[PDB]
Amino acid sequence: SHMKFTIQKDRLVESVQDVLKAVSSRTTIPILTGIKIVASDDGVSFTGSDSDISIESFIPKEEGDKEIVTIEQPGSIVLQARFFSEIVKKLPMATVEIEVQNQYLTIIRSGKAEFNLNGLDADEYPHLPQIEEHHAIQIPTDLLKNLIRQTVFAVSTSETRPILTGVNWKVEQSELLCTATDSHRLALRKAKLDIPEDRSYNVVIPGKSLTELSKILDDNQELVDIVITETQVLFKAKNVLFFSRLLDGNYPDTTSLIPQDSKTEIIVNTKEFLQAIDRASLLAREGRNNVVKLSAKPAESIEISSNSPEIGKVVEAIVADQIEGEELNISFSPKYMLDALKVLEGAEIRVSFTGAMRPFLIRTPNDETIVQLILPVRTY
Amino acid sequence: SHMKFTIQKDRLVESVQDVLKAVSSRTTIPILTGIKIVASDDGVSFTGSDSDISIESFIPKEEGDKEIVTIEQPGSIVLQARFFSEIVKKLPMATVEIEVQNQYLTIIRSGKAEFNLNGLDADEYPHLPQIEEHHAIQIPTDLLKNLIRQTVFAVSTSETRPILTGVNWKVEQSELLCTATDSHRLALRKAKLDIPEDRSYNVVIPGKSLTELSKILDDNQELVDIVITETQVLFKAKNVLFFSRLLDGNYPDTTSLIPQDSKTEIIVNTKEFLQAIDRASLLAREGRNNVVKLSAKPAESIEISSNSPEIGKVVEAIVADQIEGEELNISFSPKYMLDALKVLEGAEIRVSFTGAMRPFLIRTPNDETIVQLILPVRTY
Ligand code: NA
């Protein structure tokens, strides 16, 4: 059984680049530096994995009304991922021939170019996670991508507390609550699901897994099937399977952290506020905490400021739409503020404070589905 | 107190971004991390330098009907370049006010945003070379950019022989000859100049200087004035002065590297040849030198190949337009070959060889104005 097929370059390249995201250079299992190719009577699959994530991309032999693959001999092989990827991108013709010969030597031909790669026995490649493909949650691709974008940036990048490097996905009463935090700032996104109200899940998905999944999903409204087990999550979309290992442990309870009342409320043009916070962040120095100060007082006055000794300082006034409540002087990280503002989509934002030392909230007016929280910097 | 003016943001940002190319983060002359600003009754100049390269950009107060600058008080200041550049790009309004006050503390205001920077006395800033009145040679901007593109990549990056880190510019009988080499490969570029025939120059310009110069030159054919002295070269373009220190010493004679006679001559499609050598370079293994082999015999076909033990191999046939002379098997660095082929603009190239051990030449057929020479890889 020596694998042999002819395929369209464009589709081959697309599948290889999708699975390449699951291949890590640093790997304790040597065969995981390869891509597994399996040609069957129905088409060809490509698999890449790093043990944490696995990506399987399938190319059907025929799609629409065009012949994409011609399989002369079904079979399988493992090829080194980086070399295979670099080769396929540069093949000269629209048609590519892939043929395994003896001792796993694999021929890749296109036009007058012929590559030979030292293949490996695909029976040595690890099997995909075996999961009961049941109780799938369905989410439109565009909503899934936005859920990820509005939360994943807030996970910790430290492996000190691994559970905080993932996004908590909690499903109860047909509602999904996605929470990400690094103990300094927090992002929460809520979404209604079309599932039985009795279904319950509480898992933590690595932020890296969700960022890579979003890179392989297109901007469309097709339903993604999500199967959650005790230790894995499977995302199925058209011609693709994306598996991720879940992080073990109990995610911390952050519901007490989100304030339900406020002392000061600001409504301000989003772009105006973002541009001013961005300007206030420009005199940041390495080996020094860059902090920005916000002063607010009814009815419409905001002063943004920062100082960097021996470099300079900045002050800027902004006119708010509305300011209600107590006068406030608060300091915070401009990076966290800018990260939150970047994921909010409205013309204006609502910022809700409870004095200078408690967490504050950033939201879109009249939208209860997204909440950004930032812990301020204590000043003395 | 001192310098004070109002300027258009767009022109301020353009000038700052041009001079920032001469500012080094690793300078050992502290004031050279700054940008010198000088406001006079005619306009404002901006200068950046690393002691080898200096760039001065000028903004006239008026251009026809539009007022670009309003100078309330002439004067000068030095501001930290990186901070200044980051600030000016983000100012909120089309108009910017810059005002030096006491202790060199400088205000940068636009709309309701006010920055203060710790300025430095501009009298400590080094002076530029005073060479604007010596004889100039003129070159269209596009031709100048192309002659840099077609030569600077071949200079040495090693400091063992510093003269080889620059491009030799030899002017004689109204023609410019540019030579660059690193002892492994060589680029030769000839350009006709519209200057008196008795003008003579022979200097070596640092490769880094020409790379930075090209970044500030636009895609047009306006004449650039070039003033060459013993230790400095000045390039003058619209509102910009670019100075470079020249390298001291005698540039080596490279005429003898070219074999007097060729034994094999190939004429091939540039793009097909470049694409095949690029494919042959893909199985490189770190830290081994990438080697590609070319086999040529009259009456077709050129064979490009490479072998990477334990990874794979590649073989590609190319149909040459013409092959004359001896059968040849030669090996070379694909990096040098691709660098050379990427600067040739003809649909075809002529490749001339004198066996496997001597240098080979790459030229456009029926033209000697661009000559690329590469030493092959010695095999035993
Ligand atoms: Na420009």
Curated annotation (Swiss-Prot), chains A, B:
This is Beta sliding clamp. InterPro entries: DNA_clamp_sf, DNA_polIII_beta, DNA_polIII_beta_C, DNA_polIII_beta_cen, DNA_polIII_beta_N. GO terms for biological process: DNA strand elongation involved in DNA replication. It is found in: Cytoplasm, Nucleoid. GO terms for molecular function: 3'-5' exonuclease activity; DNA binding; DNA-directed DNA polymerase activity. Forms a ring-shaped head-to-tail homodimer around DNA which binds and tethers DNA polymerases and other proteins to the DNA. The DNA replisome complex has a single clamp-loading complex (3 tau and 1 each of delta, delta', psi and chi subunits) which binds 3 Pol III cores (1 core on the leading strand and 2 on the lagging strand) each with a beta sliding clamp dimer. Additional proteins in the replisome are other copies of gamma, psi and chi, Ssb, DNA helicase and RNA primase. Interacts with YabA, and via YabA, with DnaA. During sporulation probably interacts with SirA. Keywords: Cytoplasm, DNA replication, DNA-binding, DNA-directed DNA polymerase, Nucleotidyltransferase, Transferase. The lineage of its organism: Bacteria, Bacillati, Bacillota, Bacilli, Bacillales. Induction: Part of the dnaA-dnaN operon, which is negatively regulated by DnaA. Transcription seems to often terminate between the 2 genes. Disulfide bonds: none annotated. Belongs to the beta sliding clamp family. GO terms for cellular component: cytoplasm; DNA polymerase III complex; nucleoid.
